[PDB]
Write a protein that binds this ligand. Structure first.
Ligand code: LZQ
Length: 283
C-alpha cells in the first residue's frame, strides 16, 4: 500500500525533495481578473490568486469578482470551492457566493485569530439574538444553533435572500484545534472532522460545492480536499492501491494554486489518507 512509499520517503527524509518536485510540476495559469486594479481590495495575499478559468463568478452585474476557485474532481465525482478567509468587506460577497452556488456547507479550518493576528473577519453571528445583515448583497444570516465539541464546532445557520425572501439552511463546520505551527501530530481528529462533514450531506451531489477556507484557502484547505478525494477514490476503484496522492494533488492544482503549502503538510496528507483508508476500507 502507499504506506510502504510513505515509510520509504520517511526513511529518506526526502519529503521536502518530493514536495519540491510537485511545486515544480504543478500547473500555472493566468489570473488576469484577480490582478485587475478594481479587485485590489478584494484579495488577501499577493501570491494567492484564483486562476481565471476556474474562478467562481458572482452573479452581480457590477463586479463579479471574489477570490475563490471551483476544484472539480471528475473521476471522484466531487467538487469543492476553495476560497480565502473573508475580509472586512468581502463578507457580503462571500455569503452571496454561498447562496448563488447553492452550497450546503462551509468548512473553516482556521481560528479567527492565530498567532495574535486576525486571519479573517467574524463573518457569521456569534449569538442567535443578534443576526447579521449584509446590505450590499442583501442577505440576512442567523445563527440557529451551535455545537462545540472538543476538536471542532458545528453550527446551523439561516441564510435569507432579502430580495426574494427565500430561506436556506447552511451548515458551518469549524475545525478549531489546528495548531499555530506545524500540522497535527495525529490525523485522528482531522479525519473525524472530515467524516462529520460528509455525514451532513454537504459534500454530496444533491448540493452545490462545499465552500472551504483557511487563511489563504489553500494550505489546510487543500489537505481537506485531497484527503476526501483520495479516500473516495479508493472507495470506488477496482484497485485501491492505484490511488496516487501525488497524482490526485496535481489534478487538483489545475484548478487552484497553493494546495498544500509545505512538505509537512504533504506528509500529513499522506498520513490522513493512509489512516483513513484503514478505518474506512478495512485494514
Ligand atoms: O496554513 C497554510 O498552509 C497557509 O496557507 C498559510 C497562509 O495563509 C499563507 C498563504 C500565502 C502566503 C503566506 N506567506 C506570507 C507572505 C507572502 C508574501 C509576502 C510576504 C509574506 C508565506 C510564503 C509562502 C510561499 C512563498 C512565499 C511566502 C502564508
Amino acid at each position: 500500500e502507499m504506506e510502504k512509499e510513505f515509510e520509504q520517503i520517511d526513511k529518506s527524509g526526502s519529503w521536502a525533495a518530493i514536495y519540491q518536485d510537485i511545486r515544480h510540476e504543478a500547473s500555472d495559469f493566468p489570473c488576469r481578473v484577480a490582478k485587475l486594479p478594481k479587485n485590489k481590495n478584494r484579495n488577501r495575499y499577493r501570491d494567492v490568486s484564483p486562476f481565471d478559468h476556474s474562478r467562481i463568478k458572482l452573479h452581480q452585474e457590477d463586479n463579479d469578482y471574489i477570490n475563490a476557485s471551483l476544484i472539480k474532481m471528475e473521476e471522484a465525482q466531487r467538487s469543492y470551492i476553495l476560497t480565502q478567509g473573508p475580509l472586512p468587506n468581502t463578507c457580503g460577497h462571500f455569503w452571496e457566493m454561498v447562496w448563488e452556488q447553492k452550497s450546503r456547507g462551509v468548512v473553516m479550518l482556521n481560528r479567527v485569530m492565530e498567532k495574535g493576528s486576525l486571519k479573517c473577519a467574524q463573518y457569521w453571528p456569534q449569538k442567535e439574538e443578534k443576526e447579521m445583515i449584509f446590505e450590499d448583497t442583501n442577505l440576512k444570516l442567523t445563527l440557529i444553533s451551535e455545537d462545540i465539541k472538543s476538536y471542532y464546532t458545528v453550527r446551523q445557520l439561516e441564510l435569507e435572500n432579502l430580495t426574494t425572501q427565500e430561506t436556506r439552511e447552511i451548515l458551518h463546520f469549524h475545525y478549531t484545534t489546528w495548531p499555530d505551527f506545524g500540522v497535527p501530530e495525529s490525523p485522528a481528529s482531522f479525519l473525524n472532522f472530515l467524516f462529520k462533514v460528509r455525514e451532513s450531506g454537504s459534500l454530496s451531489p444533491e448540493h452545490g460545492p462545499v465552500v472551504v477556507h483557511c487563511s489563504a484557502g489553500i494550505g489546510r484547505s487543500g489537505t481537506f480536499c485531497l484527503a476526501d478525494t483520495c479516500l473516495l477514490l479508493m472507495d470506488k476503484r477496482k484497485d485501491p492501491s492505484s490511488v496516487d496522492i501525488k497524482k490526485v494533488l496535481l489534478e487538483m492544482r489545475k484548478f487552484r494554486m497553493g494546495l498544500i503549502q509545505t512538505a509537512d503538510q504533504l506528509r500529513f496528507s499522506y498520513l490522513a489518507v493512509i489512516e483513513g483508508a484503514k478505518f474506512i476500507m478495512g485494514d
